[PDB]
From Swiss-Prot:
Required co-factors: [2Fe-2S] cluster
Residues that hold [2Fe-2S] cluster according to the record: 41, 46, 49, 79
Record keywords, A-Z: 2Fe-2S, Electron transport, Iron, Iron-sulfur, Metal-binding, Transport
Function, in words: Ferredoxins are iron-sulfur proteins that transfer electrons in a wide variety of metabolic reactions.
Comment on bound cofactor: Binds 1 [2Fe-2S] cluster.
Molecular functions (GO terms): 2 iron, 2 sulfur cluster binding; electron transfer activity; metal ion binding
Species this protein is from: Nostoc sp. (strain PCC 7120 / SAG 25.82 / UTEX 2576)
One Gene Ontology biological process: electron transport chain
Name of this protein: Ferredoxin-1
InterPro entries named in the record: 2Fe-2S_ferredoxin-like_sf (IPR036010), 2Fe-2S_ferredoxin-type (IPR001041), 2Fe2S_fd_BS (IPR006058), Beta-grasp_dom_sf (IPR012675), Fd_pln (IPR010241)
Pfam families: Fer2 (PF00111)
Database matches in PROSITE patterns: 2FE2S_FER_1, 2FE2S_FER_2
Length: 98
C-alpha cells in the first residue's frame, strides 16, 4: 500500500502532500519527493525530527527517544516512522518537547 502524507509547517503556513510506501520511513520519502526536513541522528534517538500527528496512524516501533506520554500526545520521530494509514502531520515540533 502507498499512503498519502500531508506535511504541515504551521509557522510557515505551508502544506505539502507526499505519497509514502508502507515500508518506507516518512522522512526518506519526503526527501525523495523534494522536501528537506529537519534531522540529526536519523536513528530514532533524538528529537530533531519530531512531528505531531493531526490524523492517521504510524508505526514507529523503532524509536527510542519519546516516552509513552509523548507518544500518547501524538508525537512522532519522522526519521523512523512508517505510515499505517493516510496521515496528517505537523513538522518542526522539536521545541514542544521537554
Ligand atoms: S533525527 Fe534523531 S530521532 Fe529522528
Amino acid at each position: 500500500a502507498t499512503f498519502k502524507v500531508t506535511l504541515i509547517n504551521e509557522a510557515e503556513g505551508t502544506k505539502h502532500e507526499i505519497e509514502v510506501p508502507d515500508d518506507e520511513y516518512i522522512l526518506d520519502a519526503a526527501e525523495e519527493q523534494g522536501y528537506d526536513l529537519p534531522f540529526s541522528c536519523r536513528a530514532g534517538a533524538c528529537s530533531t525530527c519530531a512531528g505531531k500527528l493531526v490524523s492517521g496512524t504510524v508505526d514507529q516501533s523503532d524509536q527510542s527517544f519519546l516516552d509513552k506520554d509523548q507518544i500518547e500526545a501524538g508525537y512522532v520521530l519522522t526519521c523512523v516512522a512508517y505510515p499505517t494509514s493516510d496521515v496528517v502531520i505537523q513538522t518542526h515540533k522539536e521545541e514542544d518537547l521537554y
